[PDB]
């Protein structure tokens, strides 16, 4: 409260961190349906059923330029890109599928190196 501050736990290394989990999620042989925004001209039912599209590439793009205030926001939108891939896709099918095992490498991830 004012004036009366937990131990700081230190940050500094978060944007360098995300961003090798990063690298390591965009060269995963299962990201292919996750590398670019889905085209909503050419797939039926994406624009109205996904409120929030989100994929690797507007991720990248977005921790580049300072629009993630802290890590915690970034896994936001690693998990919203499977989210939004379960949604939309049947657990079996090679989408389906690719989601669930990008979410458990993410998260394997995530444990690992801030956990």
Known sequence: ????????????????????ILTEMETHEDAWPFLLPVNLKLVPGYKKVIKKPMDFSTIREKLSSGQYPNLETFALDVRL????????????????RAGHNMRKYFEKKWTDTFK
């Open 1 to 20: 409260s004012m004036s009366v501050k937990k131990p700081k736990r230190d940050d500094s290394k978060d944007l360098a961190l995300c961003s090798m």
């Open 81 to 96: 890109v499977f989210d939004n891939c379960e949604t939309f896709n049947e657990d079996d099918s090679d989408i389906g």
